[PDB]
Amino acid sequence: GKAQFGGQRFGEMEVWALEAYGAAHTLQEMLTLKSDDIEGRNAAYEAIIKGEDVPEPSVPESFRVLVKELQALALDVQTLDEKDNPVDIFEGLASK
């Protein structure tokens, strides 16, 4: 909304539009740097005001929310590599 100085909603239909086009990095932008990725957007803004190109987008925060909300449902959700070895997207903050 304008009142809250908010951004425009990029619905799943607008996602379809980008997908149908095949614009992957524009869609990845909306899904990360331009919205939900925290480290990525801070480094992005910093890059633009420094004249440097935008950084590689990190994993979205909203997916981390999904992971922990699924853990609250007592369902284990693990991100893996091709070796089927667990990958920590929380970077050690969720493990003891």
């Binding site: 909304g1 809250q4 925290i38 957007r41 801070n42 992005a44 803004y45 910093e46 005001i49």
Partner: protein, 346 residues
């Protein structure tokens, strides 16, 4: 299907006690408590430990757990060692074991019998923040307290003494569990006293009272300021899932920004400040800049006294304070000329 109706059916199975039956049960309970006392006098063991052992054998093996109040861990091995230790006593002594068992059994039957009372009482306390069943179970706790604290010698009907403990447990529960932000019971009584006060005044004045008017009717120690403070405390939180609009597509928490996490502007400014400060500290030597980096805590994150910096660089503390004066003064001249750090003054 319906939890309330189901519990009401489970309650209707147990018949209500006759005066004789009720006195009998209370008698066996009290004599049972004395039996546990006497068994403690003989055995030389903890009355609580003995009580839990007797309670275990009466209830059966269906329930086996560790009791917080007891010192030893309570397990079937332990309760068998103790039960056999208790049954190693002579006729006139071992009698008390049978008395204790009979007492606990009478206690179970007594609590089971007067559950109808709790229901017909807790039904009046509904709508105060706790569900019907929550109230009933809390009244059941008070019922248990009433049974163990009852004395049948007074010829009082059990319902009379039970009701007090039941209401007490329910009221304590409502005072404790209701508010999302838990407030001490005495403070809740204060707030509710303020409610009855303000309602009395609003009923007599034909309008809602001022802070000062309530402050008057409250008595000494109460001014308008304290009344307003009390009201501010009693304020309950509101749900983030509160509906916005007549559709279901909007929530209340959607309009609330996050004040904690740094905006990209904040992080960028902080990085620019650190870079510009390092650009400023490079206009000094490495030594006189290190004195400052150790002094204000840029490096390591600790502010040091003059004695520690002097113990590191190898000079006197006055030399360090001299170097820090020269460095700060140089940074002042650098600032006066360059006009770079000025915008970061915020």
């Amino acid at each position: 299907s319906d939890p309330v109706r189901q519990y009401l059916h489970e309650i209707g199975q147990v018949p209500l006690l006759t005066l004789e039956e009720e006195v009998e049960l209370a008698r066996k309970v009290e004599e049972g408590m004395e039996a546990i006392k006497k068994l403690s006098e003989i055995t030389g063991l903890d009355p609580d430990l003995i009580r839990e052992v007797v309670r275990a054998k009466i209830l059966g093996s269906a329930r086996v757990r560790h009791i917080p109040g007891l010192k030893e861990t309570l397990d079937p091995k332990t309760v068998e060692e103790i039960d056999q230790k208790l049954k190693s006593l002579p006729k006139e002594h071992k009698r008390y074991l049978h008395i204790a068992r009979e007492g606990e059994a009478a206690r179970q039957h007594l609590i089971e019998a007067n559950l109808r009372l709790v229901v017909s009482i807790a039904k009046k306390y509904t709508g105060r923040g706790l569900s019907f069943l929550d109230l009933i179970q809390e009244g059941n706790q008070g019922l248990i307290r009433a049974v163990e604290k009852f004395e049948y010698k007074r010829r009082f009907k059990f319902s009379t003494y039970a009701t007090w403990w039941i209401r007490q447990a329910i009221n304590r529960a409502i005072a404790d569990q209701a508010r999302t932000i838990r407030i001490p019971v005495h403070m809740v009584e204060t707030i509710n006293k303020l409610s009855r006060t303000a309602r009395q005044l609003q009923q007599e004045l034909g309008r809602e009272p001022t802070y000062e008017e309530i402050a008057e009717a409250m008595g000494p120690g109460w001014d308008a300021k304290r009344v307003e403070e009390t009201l501010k405390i009693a304020q309950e939180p509101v749900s983030l899932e509160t509906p916005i609009g007549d559709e279901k597509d909007s929530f209340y928490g959607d309009f609330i920004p996050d004040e904690h996490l740094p905006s990209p502007v904040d992080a960028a400014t902080q990085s620019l400040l650190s870079e510009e400060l390092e650009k400023a500290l490079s206009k000094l030597s490495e030594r006189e800049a290190m004195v400052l980096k150790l002094r204000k805590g840029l490096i390591d994150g600790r502010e040091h006294t003059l004695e520690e910096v002097g113990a590191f660089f190898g000079v006197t503390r006055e030399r360090i304070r001299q170097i820090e004066n020269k460095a700060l003064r140089k940074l002042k001249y650098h600032e006066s000329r360059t006009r770079k750090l000025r915008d970061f003054l915020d």
